[PDB]
Amino acid sequence: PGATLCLGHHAVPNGTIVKTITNDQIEVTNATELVQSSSTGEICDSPHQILDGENCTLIDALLGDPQCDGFQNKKWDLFVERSKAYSNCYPYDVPDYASLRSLVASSGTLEFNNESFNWTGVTQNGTSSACIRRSNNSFFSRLNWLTHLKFKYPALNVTMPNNEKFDKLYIWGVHHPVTDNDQIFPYAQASGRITVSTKRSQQTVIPNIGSRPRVRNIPSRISIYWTIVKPGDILLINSTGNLIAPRGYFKIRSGKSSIMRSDAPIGKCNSECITPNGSIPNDKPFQNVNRITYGACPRYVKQNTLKLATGMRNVPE
Amino acid sequence: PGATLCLGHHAVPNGTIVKTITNDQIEVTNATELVQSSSTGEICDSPHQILDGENCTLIDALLGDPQCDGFQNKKWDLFVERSKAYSNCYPYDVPDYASLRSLVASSGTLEFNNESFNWTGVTQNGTSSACIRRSNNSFFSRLNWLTHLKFKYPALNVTMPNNEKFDKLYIWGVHHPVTDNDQIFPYAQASGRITVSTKRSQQTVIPNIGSRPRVRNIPSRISIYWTIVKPGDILLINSTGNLIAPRGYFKIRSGKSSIMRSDAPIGKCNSECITPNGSIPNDKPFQNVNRITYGACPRYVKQNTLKLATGMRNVPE
Amino acid sequence: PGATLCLGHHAVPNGTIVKTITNDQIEVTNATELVQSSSTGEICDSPHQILDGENCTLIDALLGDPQCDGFQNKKWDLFVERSKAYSNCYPYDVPDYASLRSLVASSGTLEFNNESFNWTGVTQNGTSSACIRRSNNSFFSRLNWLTHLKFKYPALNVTMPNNEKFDKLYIWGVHHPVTDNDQIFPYAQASGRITVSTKRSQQTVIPNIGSRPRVRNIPSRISIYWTIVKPGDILLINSTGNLIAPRGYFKIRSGKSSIMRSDAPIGKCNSECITPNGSIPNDKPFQNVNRITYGACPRYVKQNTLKLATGMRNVPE
Amino acid sequence: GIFGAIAGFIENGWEGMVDGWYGFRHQNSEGIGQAADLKSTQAAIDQINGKLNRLIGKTNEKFHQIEKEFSEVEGRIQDLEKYVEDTKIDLWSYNAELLVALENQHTIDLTDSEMNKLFEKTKKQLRENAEDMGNGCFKIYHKCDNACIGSIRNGTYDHDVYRDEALNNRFQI
Amino acid sequence: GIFGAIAGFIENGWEGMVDGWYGFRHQNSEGIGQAADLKSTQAAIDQINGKLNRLIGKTNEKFHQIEKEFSEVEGRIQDLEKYVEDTKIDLWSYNAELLVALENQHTIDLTDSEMNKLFEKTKKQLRENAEDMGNGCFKIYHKCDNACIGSIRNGTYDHDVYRDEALNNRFQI
Amino acid sequence: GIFGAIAGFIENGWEGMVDGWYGFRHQNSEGIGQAADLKSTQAAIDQINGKLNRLIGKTNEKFHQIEKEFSEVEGRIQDLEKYVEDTKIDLWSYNAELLVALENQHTIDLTDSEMNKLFEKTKKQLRENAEDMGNGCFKIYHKCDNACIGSIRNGTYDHDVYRDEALNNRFQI
Numbered sequence A, B, C: 001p002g003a004t005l006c007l008g009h010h011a012v013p014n015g016t017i018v019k020t021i022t023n024d025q026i027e028v029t030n031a032t033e034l035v036q037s038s039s040t041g042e043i044c045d046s047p048h049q050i051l052d053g054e055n056c057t058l059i060d061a062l063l064g065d066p067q068c069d070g071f072q073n074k075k076w077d078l079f080v081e082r083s084k085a086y087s088n089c090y091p092y093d094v095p096d097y098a099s100l101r102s103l104v105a106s107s108g109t110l111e112f113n114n115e116s117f118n119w120t121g122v123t124q125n126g127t128s129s130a131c132i133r134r135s136n137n138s139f140f141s142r143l144n145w146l147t148h149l150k151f152k153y154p155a156l157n158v159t160m161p162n163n164e165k166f167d168k169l170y171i172w173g174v175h176h177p178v179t180d181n182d183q184i185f186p187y188a189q190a191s192g193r194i195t196v197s198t199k200r201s202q203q204t205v206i207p208n209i210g211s212r213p214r215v216r217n218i219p220s221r222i223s224i225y226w227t228i229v230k231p232g233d234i235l236l237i238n239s240t241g242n243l244i245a246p247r248g249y250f251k252i253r254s255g256k257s258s259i260m261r262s263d264a265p266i267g268k269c270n271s272e273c274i275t276p277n278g279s280i281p282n283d284k285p286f287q288n289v290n291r292i293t294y295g296a297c298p299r300y301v302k303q304n305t306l307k308l309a310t311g312m313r314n315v316p317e
Numbered sequence D, E, F: 001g002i003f004g005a006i007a008g009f010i011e012n013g014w015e016g017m018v019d020g021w022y023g024f025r026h027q028n029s030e031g032i033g034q035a036a037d038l039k040s041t042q043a044a045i046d047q048i049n050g051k052l053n054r055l056i057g058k059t060n061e062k063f064h065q066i067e068k069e070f071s072e073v074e075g076r077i078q079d080l081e082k083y084v085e086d087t088k089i090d091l092w093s094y095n096a097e098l099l100v101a102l103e104n105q106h107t108i109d110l111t112d113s114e115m116n117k118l119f120e121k122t123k124k125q126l127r128e129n130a131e132d133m134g135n136g137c138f139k140i141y142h143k144c145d146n147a148c149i150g151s152i153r154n155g156t157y158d159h160d161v162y163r164d165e166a167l168n169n170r171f172q173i
């Protein structure tokens, strides 16, 4: 009579299709998804230090646009810029705006130390009606608009050494007056110039008489520039007019900080990986949510899905 | 007596050598080439829209060098620049020539809309003998050389808003006169300046008195600049002399367009993948024809050949 | 009675752990290291031509700072800049210092041919006390500081054609005087300008009156610029003051040359692959010594170690 | 596919086997039954877990990087920024596609291998007491009750006990 | 090489087999012949076609990119443009080299596998009626005419029909 | 692991085998001995040397590249330079990790394969004169002195010489 002994393997009624080297569709008993393709839609406030810019760009928080006053001296792992943001102080441009934004974002602090510059031969603290702070004409909190003293103006030559252990970041600028109604009113002469130098650097800037298109009803412009002053080094400012002067310096730090453009709301939750769409889990090795990421994130890939087999070939009964 | 049954496999008299993980030379019954290494030598005119620049660079077609007059308003998937090309209008340079060339190439159109600028206090339509159009002194078709009116010249201040849905591209420039024979003849004063601004941008340019080395027997130069004006925004030009003014704007588009340097002839044929050597087939996944490609192309690799086995090991008889 | 025949395989008492696809720790009989992780600490003087900069940057050897006089006309596969280096001539800056350094390093020669420029209407060979050569006031060996002739100064207009087969590299600059003590002493007028042009290029530069912070007790600065003049082309210099003029040109070459920052000593030995830590062997396909390399080098990777099995699984007795 | 067991000489899988990946079915005098093999099941599962451990929860931290979206037309530098990112993404997309494809071929083959090994080990255990029917089943040429079958599944089967009975049945006429 | 059949226990291939990749040769009372096996042949061909389908005709479209040739010396930005392209090309060149090398090892092994499977399947079919001569050939211990050989090639061979004849021939003296 | 010989049906390796990677141990009337198999040993070694030849001494020359360390804060262009290099290094680091992992899985499997092939070849050689004990050892059912064992190791063993003796011993009671 005898017996029969059969060797076999399992199978499931609901197999999954995976790809192989030889076969773009083969059914296995089980698989797991390697591409993260969903976000909750919220940027989690932990474990990274989030700073929501709200109505303020990093640059406006840096310059000190009055509505950004709450940002003074703050730090961040990630500064989040909102698309609804707008400037509401004196109109300005920044040649290489992207690099200033970048180096501040990366520094990851707005720590500012005031400095007492020897400003005699000029009226400090110039204001305007397009930069309203506390219901009164005002200016950028970190900038000092330098004008005449008794309709006269001599050659400035102010010096300031960096005896610290970190790089100093100085933000400064140039006024470009509207007409000759603002050429003889705030500076008291025909011509002007600004030369901001160090032991290793020199930038000079020529002002410009001319009306621009109005931005919040002001047709003049300011042009913002910057200067990094290393340890042991010195900042020198030769001015014969038009200087929008620093009131001090920003600390430059090195670390993991950055900036991201996103309209995602900030949630009270904990997620290592941030995209502009919101935070995402980082169990998977890949993701197709966004090429822009911050933190411990899966790597961005073009595929929606990539199934790894976690079971044998399914050969149903 | 019995029988004998032998299991076996085929073999061929002409095997091919392939590489493996363990063996840089092993013979298989058959293989196929994965690297495309040949072109027919012609750029196929289909399915991409080809625009042969012939004697004209994109920049010369853009500015409107008279021999490029046929290019007005044309579109392209691929603009092909020829090495035999040359300029035959007023001598000029473009700071960041590469970026202007690039952004126009990528925009993929020369669509130009004329605009009526309020030019009073100057003589429009200045010409020269080095830009011959239709056997008569002429200039770049898209530029307006602005000179005096009755040996006098006041402060210009012309404005032009962009109420369209696309970015406007404005091309303009500065004249740099040869001597004081061309300082008191076309502008009628000692000094000049050009300030081309928007709500978000400002460029100012100072002219220069001085002879350059002659280029087609003219020793003066023009310097070409550009300005993008977004929807809702405005272009403003403050001029006190020397303006080479726009006659309007170019449409900026986004799409798949580009530019390529090649001397390959254009053929009447259909090929998805274009290199500077000519079109190539795209059945293979790799190619060593050129690192410069346009379209659906195999990926460039350094290897001449890579044979994929399509048969078993060959073990001849 | 019969016999027994057992098939088997070897094993070793000292196995090595390797990683696989399925297993991060599996013991094999033997392995070899694929990551080079050590240097001898010396840059080998062979087979690449090494030029130790010692106290001199490439830029200082180029300009001809007196202590760099020994570098005149030298070639290199690799120029090695030392961190102890310092400048000891007239204080200067180079806008785009990094690009000049880069293109010279890559050219891989300091070959200089003197040229006789028609310098009448000025005193050549200006000197200073901060550039001491051979115990006497001096200047950069490749630059000609142009000053007045009998307290007067006319409009310069000197021309120099390139009839060679290679690009010519011209180094030149602008003086920025300290006060009006050095505005009426070396140039003899109120204002100045420099325009260095070709058939295809134009750079103009405005001097600046103003004291800078002292660098080796001099508060003036020079600003260094460059111009490449191709075959068939011409260099033109319009000067009305302040020109720091070329005494000729440098040969531009194309080849394999570069520059590296390192304090490693140069040894008498032979190694294909150079890092800043010293030379390294290149038997291994990978290395974690430095991302900066020159020559035939293993590729840089983040891992300290990667063991390739060169034996079977070890299954001890 | 590479060993020829799963979707090969084994015609199909067993949906009714829920407590293991591989196992045994038998017919003897006492009925017809099934039991899973734990060691081969676990061998397969451990290898798959090995692959998972290299892939799940292993991410790389990045912080400040380049900008990847742009609101202005800029030309050369923006071209390079986009190109660098597009290049990077294609290379990682390629890595991910190849990785999954290879892993999946390997997983399929190792699972086929585990089936094959169990089969082979069972064949050797039976010595001269059974023959291979070619479909994963052995014809056992002796009375083999539940304890006997169990003894084969547990690796305690003594082929000498039944050899006389089985040779007689095998080499009959 | 990994299964040990092709360029292993099978001494060589058959140039005279032109209608398949794998097959059978026989000697019996009625002569010496050859016939290709379609199923194993097609199994191999389908897998190779699978690999080809992932590689042939699968290209990626690119449009405006960076410049890759330069007529002027420029320095820093040009350095970065060249470096990015040179980096990219090395990585794709590496991808292509590895891809082909792995694909080719796999193709060689899967073809060896198909030979091995056919051999194994034929061995089991023969049960106790043949012995393995060690070179891919079976000594069949019974009269096996063309229809009988055909029955083995077609999977219809009934080993019970010949078992008595074959055991007698096998266990002779 | 994939063939089931090394760390499978062979319980362990032999530290006392120093003149080869694979071999034979025997017990017969004349004693107990060991001899290495050169052909299988060399087959394994050649394949590993093949892999080494693609990896050792194969480097790529690079010369002027981008700067990779910076002493000043610069922003946009420096961001791109660092990002390009960091991107490159991650991709090569990935290539190196995967390469080693695959190579090592393949090396382990090919060495297991060589053991399996030698075993299989020896089994076929023995024909009906031995049985597989399931642990890499064959019970040889005939007097097999040192020359006889040597004849099996050298591929000159004539199974017909001993078949009568062995069938008698095998199918005894």
Ligand SMILES: *[C@@H]1O[C@H](CO)[C@@H](O[C@@H]2O[C@H](CO)[C@@H](O[C@@H]3O[C@H](CO[C@H]4O[C@H](CO)[C@@H](O)[C@H](O)[C@@H]4O)[C@@H](O)[C@H](O[C@H]4O[C@H](CO)[C@@H](O)[C@H](O)[C@@H]4O)[C@@H]3O)[C@H](O)[C@H]2NC(C)=O)[C@H](O)[C@H]1NC(C)=O
Pocket: A030, A031, A032, A283, A310, D052, D056, D057
């Ligand atoms: C098809 O294939 C997959 C992969 O092999 C199987 O899914 C795995 O199943 C196990 C066990 O059920 C899961 O283990 C659990 O992990 C949880 C961690 O949560 C997240 O993190 C992982 C990565 O670490 C993510 O992949 C996952 O998506 C989760 O979001 C733990 O919290 C669990 O712990 C709980 O149970 C254990 C009991 O062992 C206790 O020790 C704990 O106290 C706690 O109660 C648990 O360890 C594993 O995460 C799954 N992996 C994946 C990738 O999804 C499927 O089961 C399989 N399907 C079938 C039908 O077999």
Ligand SMILES: *[C@@H]1O[C@H](CO)[C@@H](O[C@@H]2O[C@H](CO)[C@@H](O[C@@H]3O[C@H](CO[C@H]4O[C@H](CO)[C@@H](O)[C@H](O)[C@@H]4O)[C@@H](O)[C@H](O[C@H]4O[C@H](CO)[C@@H](O)[C@H](O)[C@@H]4O)[C@@H]3O)[C@H](O)[C@H]2NC(C)=O)[C@H](O)[C@H]1NC(C)=O
Pocket: B030, B031, B032, B283, B310, E052, E056, E057
């Ligand atoms: C060695 O190995 C290779 C690869 O396995 C074999 O070459 C393949 O052979 C087949 C059949 O002969 C070819 O199929 C044909 O493809 C044509 C498409 O043309 C181009 O596109 C392919 C990719 O799609 C390119 O790789 C190729 O180079 C071509 O330039 C079709 O037009 C053909 O269609 C015609 O025949 C079929 C009959 O099946 C009809 O349906 C049609 O109406 C029409 O008449 C055909 O389908 C395949 O392209 C080849 N591949 C490659 C990569 O070259 C060799 O045959 C093999 N050598 C030996 C000796 O076996």
Ligand SMILES: *[C@@H]1O[C@H](CO)[C@@H](O[C@@H]2O[C@H](CO)[C@@H](O[C@@H]3O[C@H](CO[C@H]4O[C@H](CO)[C@@H](O)[C@H](O)[C@@H]4O)[C@@H](O)[C@H](O[C@H]4O[C@H](CO)[C@@H](O)[C@H](O)[C@@H]4O)[C@@H]3O)[C@H](O)[C@H]2NC(C)=O)[C@H](O)[C@H]1NC(C)=O
Pocket: C030, C031, C032, C283, C310, F052, F056, F057
């Ligand atoms: C564990 O696994 C590894 C790799 O399989 C084995 O190491 C190899 O062993 C061989 C032979 O002993 C070595 O071969 C020798 O190479 C020398 C070259 O020197 C350098 O270059 C190689 C690459 O080419 C580097 O990898 C290496 O680190 C060296 O720094 C030659 O100079 C030698 O030549 C001498 O001997 C031969 C005899 O064959 C003579 O022809 C010559 O005249 C001369 O006297 C020799 O060829 C090989 O380099 C080793 N490879 C690696 C990567 O290290 C281990 O042996 C193995 N361990 C065990 C216990 O088996």
Ligand SMILES: *[C@@H]1O[C@H](CO[C@H]2O[C@@H](C)[C@@H](O)[C@@H](O)[C@@H]2O)[C@@H](O[C@@H]2O[C@H](CO)[C@@H](O)[C@H](O)[C@H]2NC(C)=O)[C@H](O)[C@H]1NC(C)=O
Pocket: A054, A055, A067, A086
């Ligand atoms: C951030 O700003 C929003 C948006 O409203 C701003 O729109 C600008 C164009 C400008 O007109 C500015 O004055 C205005 O505030 C603020 O919401 C608005 O806040 C004002 C405050 O007076 C209210 O009167 C409005 O009801 C309210 N409108 C909307 C649509 O929200 C918002 O308060 C401010 N948030 C922060 C955190 O500063």
Ligand SMILES: *[C@@H]1O[C@H](CO[C@H]2O[C@@H](C)[C@@H](O)[C@@H](O)[C@@H]2O)[C@@H](O[C@@H]2O[C@H](CO)[C@@H](O)[C@H](O)[C@H]2NC(C)=O)[C@H](O)[C@H]1NC(C)=O
Pocket: C054, C055, C067, C086
């Ligand atoms: C490269 O320079 C070193 C370092 O010393 C230099 O430090 C500068 C800040 C400046 O003060 C300069 O004058 C000085 O030379 C040279 O070493 C020094 O050389 C001087 C030469 O008079 C000696 O007096 C010192 O003893 C010596 N000091 C040290 C610490 O080495 C070095 O000679 C020179 N090397 C080359 C190849 O030029």
Ligand SMILES: *[C@@H]1O[C@H](CO)[C@@H](O[C@@H]2O[C@H](CO)[C@@H](O)[C@H](O)[C@H]2NC(C)=O)[C@H](O)[C@H]1NC(C)=O
Pocket: A157, A158, A159, C178, C179, C211, C213, C214
């Ligand atoms: C601008 O200010 C600086 C600093 O006060 C002046 O530089 C100093 O000048 C004296 C000579 O008058 C030197 O002895 C000092 O060593 C300098 N000090 C420093 C700290 O550099 C500079 O001269 C001023 N400019 C003008 C035009 O007077």
Ligand SMILES: *[C@@H]1O[C@H](CO)[C@@H](O[C@@H]2O[C@H](CO)[C@@H](O)[C@H](O)[C@H]2NC(C)=O)[C@H](O)[C@H]1NC(C)=O
Pocket: A037, A038, A039, A276, A277, A288, A289, A290
């Ligand atoms: C996350 O946001 C990105 C960027 O906004 C989304 O991708 C864009 O989707 C819109 C609408 O479908 C398209 O018009 C854009 O072209 C896409 N941009 C890019 C760069 O892909 C993406 O769909 C969002 N993903 C999730 C999961 O919400």
Ligand SMILES: *[C@@H]1O[C@H](CO)[C@@H](O[C@@H]2O[C@H](CO)[C@@H](O)[C@H](O)[C@H]2NC(C)=O)[C@H](O)[C@H]1NC(C)=O
Pocket: A178, A179, A211, A213, A214, B157, B158, B159
């Ligand atoms: C240059 O032109 C613009 C536009 O005509 C002038 O700006 C206008 O000036 C009036 C006051 O004179 C304002 O009330 C308008 O709102 C402005 N219009 C626009 C559209 O901006 C500008 O003043 C002119 N410049 C000079 C120096 O007169």
Ligand SMILES: *[C@@H]1O[C@H](CO)[C@@H](O[C@@H]2O[C@H](CO)[C@@H](O)[C@H](O)[C@H]2NC(C)=O)[C@H](O)[C@H]1NC(C)=O
Pocket: B037, B038, B039, B276, B277, B288, B289, B290
């Ligand atoms: C396609 O054209 C490219 C670029 O012109 C060719 O590659 C060049 O070949 C010339 C002459 O052999 C060399 O001097 C250049 O150094 C090469 N340049 C590069 C970037 O490789 C290429 O040979 C041509 N290919 C085909 C198939 O025609």
Ligand SMILES: *[C@@H]1O[C@H](CO)[C@@H](O[C@@H]2O[C@H](CO)[C@@H](O)[C@H](O)[C@H]2NC(C)=O)[C@H](O)[C@H]1NC(C)=O
Pocket: B178, B179, B211, B213, B214, C157, C158, C159
């Ligand atoms: C600056 O120098 C150049 C070269 O001497 C002058 O250009 C030449 O001018 C004459 C007319 O005076 C032309 O006929 C020549 O063809 C020119 N020669 C070259 C080589 O270009 C230029 O005119 C000078 N500048 C001034 C203001 O006199």
Ligand SMILES: *[C@@H]1O[C@H](CO)[C@@H](O[C@@H]2O[C@H](CO)[C@@H](O)[C@H](O)[C@H]2NC(C)=O)[C@H](O)[C@H]1NC(C)=O
Pocket: C037, C038, C039, C276, C277, C288, C289, C290
């Ligand atoms: C080679 O030198 C590099 C660069 O100096 C070393 O890497 C640095 O090590 C220091 C000290 O441990 C760290 O502070 C830096 O952050 C490291 N820099 C980088 C870019 O990694 C490296 O350790 C040296 N390697 C060897 C083998 O000597």
Ligand SMILES: CC(=O)N[C@H]1[C@H]([C@H](O)[C@H](O)CO)O[C@@](O)(C(=O)O)C[C@@H]1O
Pocket: A125, A126, A127, A128, A129, A130, A137, A145, A147, A177, A178, A182, A185, A186, A220
């Ligand atoms: C410091 C100073 O002079 N501020 C005055 C400005 C400037 O003159 C112009 O903004 C420069 O163009 O003009 C105002 O009309 C204004 O904008 O509110 C009044 C203000 O007191």
Ligand SMILES: CC(=O)N[C@H]1[C@H]([C@H](O)[C@H](O)CO)O[C@@](O)(C(=O)O)C[C@@H]1O
Pocket: B125, B126, B127, B128, B129, B130, B137, B145, B147, B177, B178, B182, B185, B186, B220
């Ligand atoms: C608008 C105008 O004035 N055009 C005149 C120009 C310019 O004066 C110079 O090109 C500027 O340097 O000079 C010409 O000799 C010329 O080049 O043909 C005559 C021409 O009528």
Ligand SMILES: CC(=O)N[C@H]1[C@H]([C@H](O)[C@H](O)CO)O[C@@](O)(C(=O)O)C[C@@H]1O
Pocket: C125, C126, C127, C128, C129, C130, C137, C145, C147, C177, C178, C182, C185, C186, C220
């Ligand atoms: C050519 C010339 O005039 N050289 C003189 C310079 C320059 O006037 C200033 O360096 C320019 O600012 O000044 C010196 O005091 C000096 O530095 O040694 C004397 C020197 O003879």
Ligand SMILES: *[C@@H]1O[C@H](CO)[C@@H](O)[C@H](O)[C@H]1NC(C)=O
Pocket: A014, A015, A016, A029, A030, A031
């Ligand atoms: C199959 O169905 C079961 C029961 O609902 C479920 O738990 C399992 O996840 C499914 N598996 C697959 C691979 O779809």
Ligand SMILES: *[C@@H]1O[C@H](CO)[C@@H](O)[C@H](O)[C@H]1NC(C)=O
Pocket: B014, B015, B016, B029, B030, B031
């Ligand atoms: C071998 O020769 C034949 C007959 O000419 C040809 O068709 C085939 O392509 C060749 N194959 C290889 C792999 O070279």
